[PDB]
Amino acid sequence: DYGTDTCPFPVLANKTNKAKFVGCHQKCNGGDQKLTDGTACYVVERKVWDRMTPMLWYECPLGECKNGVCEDLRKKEDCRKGN
Amino acid sequence: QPDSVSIPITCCFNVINKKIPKQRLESYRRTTSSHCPREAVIFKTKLDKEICADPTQKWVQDFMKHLD
């Protein structure tokens, strides 16, 4: 009823404070929310995201979304999580 | 220092298709394109479920105005 793809999606942000999404898929109102292919993402399992300390600089791996998966682009950057 | 910028924990990727019935709506929060990839408004329902909405749609501006 609220759509299966209108939930807010977890992010992280690098030194520019501009956010990128964490992973490429989540459950949304009991459905499967999938980000478009090519979207930049952090290759980070969600249970990890959920247990991170806000504002701590972490070494986050980057990737792009493909068919609901954050495919590792083999490069890294420091990122941090909101409060 | 310790940095005092506020970083969002979630951003919106897609928004709702039709206006939400007012009787459901409980709260809102606004997502800045300064940090999020696209600016959006996040309504929170009486069941504490969160819905992404387009800040340019007329009905959003009415409702978030309603909630003040």
From Swiss-Prot, chain A:
GO terms for molecular function: C-C chemokine binding. It comes from the Eukaryota. Keywords: Disulfide bond, Glycoprotein, Secreted, Signal. The keyword Disulfide bond applies. Disulfide bonds join 7-28, 24-65, 41-70, 60-79. Glycans are attached at residue 14. Its main location: secreted. It is found in: Secreted. GO terms for cellular component: extracellular region. The keyword Lyase does not apply. Salivary chemokine-binding protein which binds to host chemokines CCL1, CCL3, CCL4, CCL8, CCL17, CCL18 and CCL22. This is Evasin P974. It comes from Amblyomma cajennense (Cayenne tick).
UniProtKB/Swiss-Prot annotation, chain B:
It is found in: Secreted. Changing residue 18 to A: Decreases binding to Link domain of TNFAIP6. Keywords: Chemotaxis, Cytokine, Disulfide bond, Glycoprotein, Heparin-binding, Inflammatory response, Pyrrolidone carboxylic acid, Secreted, Signal. It comes from the Eukaryota. O-glycosylated. Changing residue 19 to A: Decreases binding to Link domain of TNFAIP6. One of its GO terms (cellular component) is extracellular region. Belongs to the intercrine beta (chemokine CC) family. Monomer. Interacts with TNFAIP6 (via Link domain). This is C-C motif chemokine 7. It comes from Homo sapiens (Human). The gene is CCL7. The chain holds residues 39 to 91 of 99 of the full protein.
